[PDB]
Design a protein around this ligand. Structure first.
Ligand code: GTP
Ligand code: GTP
Ligand code: GDP
Ligand code: GDP
Ligand code: MG
Ligand code: MG
Lengths: 97, 428, 428, 426, 426
């Protein structure tokens, strides 16, 4: 629970600034919404340098993938179906096991 | 204690390894989150063989994913079990090989071999007693076929005693996707004979033939092809992870197999494959497993054993059974088809039993055997590689990397010396 | 990550750019302004203001062609500095574009490619598009390869361009430019995609039921070709094929880098209504001489390498079945030095449809890139014509007055005798 | 507390000072009266709560400064600070150095003396003039000469117009230019030579304004001086003072002539369509076609580079850009500088004037390279002055003014020796 | 009883110490006001080592912030804990050195020592039993590299027996921001070898390498770099401030770390740096600390120890462990990498245990070691200084101060003699 407590604390500390972040966006988007794009890019970047889908099991953690010689270009998702996994159970009934 | 490190090379290797890491995660009751949700105590007793401990009741696969192209990892990471692998184990680069064995083996591999060597040594020093590593790749690529040979050569010098098993993918002549595929294959098998304890030759076309006929699947994807190879190789170490009526291990099979070090290529076989219509009329019995296995259709290589002589046979079984039929069937098949077995070695059949059945299935069996059929692949490659080298076609790609021309000959010379002595073992 | 930069040369190059980039805008989803209401990074680049900028260099020697783009719908899509223009053109003169007029704008274009190479981190290759007929597309294009070859020795240099049609012609002095351009596409090219518009003219009228097509209708089909090549790069697939993958598995010798393309199916919506589309059906049209995008019959030659790009709703099962059927055809001959000459590539995303186009919306598609020796007869017709021109000494005063030596004509003519001879050696 | 005093001379000095001062006022928020509805390095407080520019505009013609006196900022400026003369030199260094200077030398000296009395810790004297005008040449020469003995240690920055190699607004400019160089050699600490033609080409090519003017040029001059002074005015992770970047620019007492560059300089319409980041801006600072002096550093070798980033910027990107520019064979360094960079970072982005030309941009860069490629311009001037002095044209004017004609040959030989020293470094 | 006075030199030193004083104030539970809001009794048990008592339950840092320019003092007190420092401890001059070692060491050094030494002596006579002072400075500056050398020399005469550690900042050749950087480093290391008990060689570039790769920070500022350099020297004295199973202090290591007095240069190391994605897949174990400890990428100096032989190793662990694992991992790493260890000293590793974990974390480890790789740095400086000094470049700035020319020669001789006897010990 000690590391579980710190896990909830990380959720607690990441939240509080998001209120402080949000209220500027609502205050800034009082005249025109034509101009709020960098906020939407900023609050949807994610926790860490990740491009793919968020992992709801681990708490929205976005692990990075930076191992490319001396360049270290982050891996982008070309986007696809991303279908639910076989579980080995779907095919075993598809194959009659 | 008895640990295995998974080496993962190439787009072929990355996809099949991702498939393999899912079935045993289902077997060991591990969620995509990473924790343990299983019910039986034996589902979590020997999970340290493939997994390493992580805080919060989490386990991480002991894999080293390698490819020369960065986009393959994103497909691996976007996979449903994509958040189960530690990112530091992933090693890759932005410059590929372009199906060139030479570029992977010499030019671009030399900049990446250091980092993967750091990763595998990190995983090697983690476990107290390592039995050996495990690399899966394709011989038709530029990374697994290419620098994957270079990785094997180094770790044999570093760790000679540890076992080195390879579920390598040999290209098919009837269906191929690469013209320099004989070039990479001829420069790869020479690395196999010198540095490999045992190799398993899986052909995708033979896998394609099975689901054409045995499973009658309308549209089986490569994930289905990934499903068979993972199930085949999960049956190799099911006796290792779980106790059985007669226990065995990788070293138990390999020591009981290899009569001479030059011969370590085999065809694997899997028992429980039936189509949907076949499930309606069947009875799960020991002879039906044995009957299905010795039919040459079930086999996932492109060699007919009826044209050669079965050198040795290893037949492991998964699930709770009796040894009455297990011995009575192996004796029956030994005596009936006597001409397909060599006379110099009696009792070529090696048997092992694993009590734990596969998940969601009752009975199963896995078999590894050496026969004189395997040169149907090797010599047929020689019908290509030699008939592509005499005019020096596609050579400037290989010559531009800075190596000589004697290497193609010596790899060819080793391959002709490989078959020739092994021809002699047929008529002995 | 993977990136492609377009260096289209000439008015034709400007016009196919207009066609390609509109198609590129439709697939990813770019608005005419340039905002989304990373599959796009290979073609587009992010700005500070979050604009997605085309990574193409539109270069031309006359203002009028590029100024039409400046006043088009996508005026606020292209950077104005990027569209490079010239005050004076060559007017169907290779010599003016290669010795007099090019030198004024050599640096300014060459600073641009460096700046575009600055933006990209890992550059895959260069797409250079031009025409053999026009002076700028032949003269100015020939010089720039010579300079970017020494600027980037390793970077790939793809070449789709327009060959003069063997009967119809928009110029009389075209063979002088065409012959003198063949030197650059030999020692400063990695691949080549020669096409006459006449083959497109026959195919569109026969298949797409447009009896009065325009140049944009042609450019839509060529855009489909470039889209199919980069499709495995932009989106995921079962067998992703990069640029270097099929550069290796298409080029047996450095002197042989002229495949022939083929796209299928190409059928109208009313035509599509009555016919089933399947992998075997659509792949069979790719070997028909009447559907070839180059006026030659491969049945008079022999394939040594065929590159295969499946797109859309495709399955590896029908991939191998189609390959099996084609290999069992005496009409399709293969060279004795390539038994496996199919390079399989599989993508998921189906090709999109442009409103106002000609192709109907389909679920599956195929792309074909076969190198053969039947292309060499087309160069012989150019040798047949240009030599009978050059003996008469016509139009010689035009080129000599520019300031190049007349002996280069004979050398360029002498060269293509050697290229045609080399293709005959493979034909043996 | 850091203080920089302006000593602007001539028509160029007056116009450039008015430019720089509107940029200082808009930067510090000061209204045209001089009231605020950082600043102390340029302004000074008064009993009335006004802010006083620390500038000395000096000219020999009245009208150039009376335009300011009837301009908008008349109440902002000091009637005593603006020092005017009745009769000019009319492009005559001899008039400007021997006949008309001594009348108001004392007045100018007293004005800067009271300004230095007002200042507590003086950082620098920024002195602006031209090499073409007789006023901006001879008066600058004499005030450097007396200011050197008035303050031995106080640093004297020298921003001056150099005659353009092709276009010229005068015929008798090279005589003044060759006679002035002694003072910028032996009485200057840094020199920032500028020719108009380079800025002309820059503003036509990049800024899309086909018909610019002197105020358009003065906007960029004010911008570069402001970017120089931004580290003193506001906070930065690596603040850079005058002493730091003169020490890491001047290897020898005879070599104090660096060349400058500002990036990015693009109009707003084109600024719509490109990313502006550290690598692109530092690559634009290195292009020979963007250099504000008509010479190619690719023909010479860089031996020092001062660097002033500004705005939204990270030292990680700074180091990455430094690595990228170091990995380039087209860019050369002399063998005795493996490390020749002087990096500084400031937080506040460069502000924008309404009616200006540059768009507001979050990150900017100012480059100051000391190289050996500048000597070719002095060589061109040497050829022009040699074929001037061969027939002894316009000599009678200066001789009647009252200098000794051997000083012409002495200055020619001195600049030849300077070029020889630059050859020795090169 | 065992007290440490925190000397502070230069802009780099001021920012490093300011981050440091915040860090231990968090550790000891000290509010920005200066009082105690902490919970554990051990959080206030040995706080007198760094703090001095004031009325109202207030504690003041025992720091002497010294710099030659007042432009950094404002940013020091503009920070979070800017008002926790006593204003009388701030000692600074008016004019800086401009990255000139000569000016800081001799010219504008002479008047500012007396204010520094009086403040230093006042804190010296405050505590009863001083273990030793502590100074952080940069070897590429004008005050930390220059002035910073002078006060060390005088306090060695005043206080010889007290421990003298220096967390100096050595300039990097690949990434450098100063042209006269080799000259300052040439004349500072000679002062380091003669008068210093131990030195910690930090490098900003290797800190930049870590944050790019180990932490994968998108925008690393110098505060992040200051966070690391404060953490390691927090791990040096955590065993001093808090009891452990096996106790140690500065003199426990320094006696055990110096085989011969000429060698006092060490490269530090901190075990648990992981990126946010690395938090997800790990098991916190002592072998994981040791594995990350000896990976050559973890060092934040500019020398790979795999090219050198290891003289002596320190491993100080912060928190609660069992030492059988600690001894087995030290034994495991000693036998495996036998070639990298010296043979004339078996058991090169010294181990220490601090029971109190670092705040916000469960487990950490700190590492100090002397290897032959550090000589790679000194000759690498020599290749650039000799390239400068052969042509007498940048010399008139130094020569104008007033020293003679042999000081560079003797400083060049000293480090050449240093590396020669260092090479012999390999
Ligand atoms: N496929 C295709 N080919 C074209 C198109 N436009 C012109 N061409 C070919 O290009 C040849 C002439 O070259 P252009 O592109 O028109 O002009 P250019 O390349 O700039 O050279 P100059 O005319 O000398 O300026 C013609 O003979 C056509 O065969 C087009 O829109 N599509
Ligand atoms: N950049 C710039 N140069 C100027 C400006 N005004 C004058 N100059 C330059 O100054 C030269 C002539 O000197 P002026 O500044 O006009 O007058 P002066 O410096 O007082 O010298 P005299 O004319 O002899 O009185 C011209 O060749 C111009 O190039 C200006 O506002 N901006
Ligand atoms: N059985 C099987 N084969 C595959 C799969 N994916 C790719 N391949 C084979 O791998 C070959 C291409 O491998 P490649 O990416 O070049 O390997 P690399 O060079 O080591 O990265 C093709 O010939 C495919 O037949 C898969 O999921 N299953
Ligand atoms: N690691 C680190 N280095 C710094 C920091 N601030 C400044 N520096 C370094 O300090 C050097 C400048 O020091 P300087 O101000 O001249 O020192 P001084 O002359 O003693 O005042 C630069 O090269 C920087 O690399 C910091 O916060 N962290
Ligand atoms: Mg044209
Ligand atoms: Mg004037």
């Amino acid at each position: 629970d000690y590391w579980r407590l710190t896990d909830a604390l990380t959720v607690e500390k990441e939240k509080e600034f998001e209120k402080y972040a949000r209220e500027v966006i609502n205050f800034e988007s009082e005249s025109t919404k034509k101009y709020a794009y960098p906020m939407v890019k900023a609050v949807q970047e994610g926790v860490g340098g990740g491009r793919g889908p968020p992992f709801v099991g681990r708490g929205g953690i976005r692990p990075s993938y930076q191992a490319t010689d001396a360049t270290g270009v982050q891996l982008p998702c070309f986007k696809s179906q991303g279908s639910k996994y076989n579980d080995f159970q779907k095919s075993k009934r598809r194959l009659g096991f | 204690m008895r640990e295995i490190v998974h080496l993962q090379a190439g787009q072929c290797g990355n996809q099949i390894g991702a498939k393999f890491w899912e079935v045993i995660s289902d077997e060991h009751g591990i969620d995509p989150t990473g924790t343990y949700h299983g019910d039986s105590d034996l589902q979590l007793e020997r999970i340290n063989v493939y997994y390493n401990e992580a805080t919060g009741g989490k386990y991480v696969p002991r894999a080293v994913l390698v490819d020369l192209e960065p986009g393959t990892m994103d497909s691996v990471r976007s996979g449903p079990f994509g958040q189960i692998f530690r990112p530091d184990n992933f090693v890759f680069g932005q410059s590929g090989a372009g199906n060139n064995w030479a570029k992977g083996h010499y030019t671009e591999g030399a900049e990446l071999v250091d980092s993967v060597l750091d990763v595998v040594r990190k995983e090697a020093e983690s476990c107290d007693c390592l039995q050996g590593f495990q690399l899966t790749h394709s011989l038709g690529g530029g990374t697994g076929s290419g620098m994957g040979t270079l990785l094997i050569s180094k770790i044999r010098e570093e760790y000679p005693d540890r076992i080195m098993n390879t579920f390598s993918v040999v290209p098919s002549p009837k269906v191929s996707d690469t013209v320099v595929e004989p070039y990479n294959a001829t420069l790869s098998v020479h690395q196999l004979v010198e540095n490999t304890d045992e190799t398993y030759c899986i052909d995708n076309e033979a896998l394609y033939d099975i689901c054409f006929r045995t499973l009658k699947l309308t549209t089986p994807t490569y994930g289905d092809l990934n499903h068979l190879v993972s199930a085949t190789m999960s049956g190799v170490t099911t006796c290792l992870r779980f106790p059985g009526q007669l226990n065995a291990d990788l070293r138990k099979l390999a020591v009981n197999m290899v009569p001479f070090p030059r011969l370590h290529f085999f065809m694997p076989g899997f028992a429980p494959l039936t189509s949907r219509g076949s499930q309606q009329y069947r009875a799960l019995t020991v002879p039906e497993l044995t009957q299905q296995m010795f039919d040459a259709k079930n086999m996932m290589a492109a060699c007919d054993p009826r044209h050669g002589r079965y050198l040795t046979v290893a037949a492991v079984f998964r699930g709770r059974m009796s040894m009455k039929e297990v011995d009575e069937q192996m004796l029956n098949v030994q005596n009936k088809n006597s001409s397909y077995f060599v006379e110099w070695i009696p009792n070529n059949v090696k048997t092992a039993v694993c009590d734990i059945p596969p998940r969601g299935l009752k009975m199963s069996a896995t078999f590894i055997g050496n026969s004189t059929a395997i040169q149907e692949l090797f010599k047929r490659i020689s019908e290509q590689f030699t008939a592509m080298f005499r005019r020096k076609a596609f050579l400037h790609w290989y010559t531009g990397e800075g190596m000589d021309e004697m290497e193609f000959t010596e790899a060819e010379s080793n391959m002709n010396d490989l078959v020739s002595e092994y021809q002699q073992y047929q008529d002995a | 990550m993977r990136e492609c930069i377009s260096i289209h040369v000439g008015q034709a190059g400007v016009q196919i750019g207009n066609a390609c980039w509109e198609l590129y805008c439709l697939e990813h989803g770019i608005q005419p302004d340039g905002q989304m209401p990373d599959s796009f990074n290979t073609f587009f680049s992010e700005t500070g203001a979050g604009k997605h900028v085309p990574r193409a260099v539109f270069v031309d020697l006359e203002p009028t062609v590029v100024d039409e783009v400046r006043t088009g719908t996508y005026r606020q899509l292209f950077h104005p500095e990027q569209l490079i223009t010239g005050k004076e053109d060559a007017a169907n003169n290779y010599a003016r574009g290669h010795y007099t007029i090019g030198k004024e704008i050599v640096d300014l274009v060459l600073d641009r490619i460096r700046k575009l190479a600055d933006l990209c981190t890992g550059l895959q290759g260069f797409l250079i598009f031009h025409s053999f007929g026009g002076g700028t597309g032949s003269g100015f294009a020939s010089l720039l390869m010579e300079r970017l070859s020494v600027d980037y020795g390793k970077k790939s240099k793809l070449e789709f361009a327009i060959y003069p049609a063997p009967q119809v012609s928009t110029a009389v002095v075209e063979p002088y430019n065409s012959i003198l351009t063949t030197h650059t596409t030999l020692e400063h090219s990695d691949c080549a995609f020669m096409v006459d518009n006449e083959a497109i003219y026959d195919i569109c009228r026969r298949n797409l039921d447009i009896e009065r097509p325009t140049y944009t209708n042609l450019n839509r089909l060529i855009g489909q070709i470039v889209s199919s090549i980069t499709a495995s790069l932009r989106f995921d697939g079962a067998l992703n094929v990069d640029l270097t993958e099929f550069q290796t598995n298409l080029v047996p010798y450095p002197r042989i880098h002229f495949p022939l393309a083929t796209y299928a199916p190409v059928i109208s919506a009313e035509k599509a209504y009555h016919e089933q589309l399947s992998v075997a059906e659509i792949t069979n049209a790719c070997f028909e001489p009447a559907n070839q995008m180059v006026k030659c019959d491969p049945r008079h030659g022999k394939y040594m390498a065929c590159c295969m790009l499946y797109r859309g709703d495709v399955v590896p099962k029908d991939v191998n079945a189609a390959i099996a059927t084609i290999k069992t055809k005496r009409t399709i001959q293969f060279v004795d030095w390539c038994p496996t000459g199919f390079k399989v590539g599989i993508n998921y995303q189906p090709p999109t449809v442009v409103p106002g186009g000609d192709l109907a919306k389909v679920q599956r598609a195929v792309c074909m890139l076969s190198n053969t020796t039947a292309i060499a007869e087309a160069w012989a017709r150019l040798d047949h014509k240009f030599d009978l021109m050059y003996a008469k000494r016509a139009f010689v005063h035009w080129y000599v007055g520019e300031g190049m030596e007349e002996g280069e004509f004979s050398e360029a003519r002498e060269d293509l005798a050697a290229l045609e001879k080399d293709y005959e050696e493979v034909g043996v």
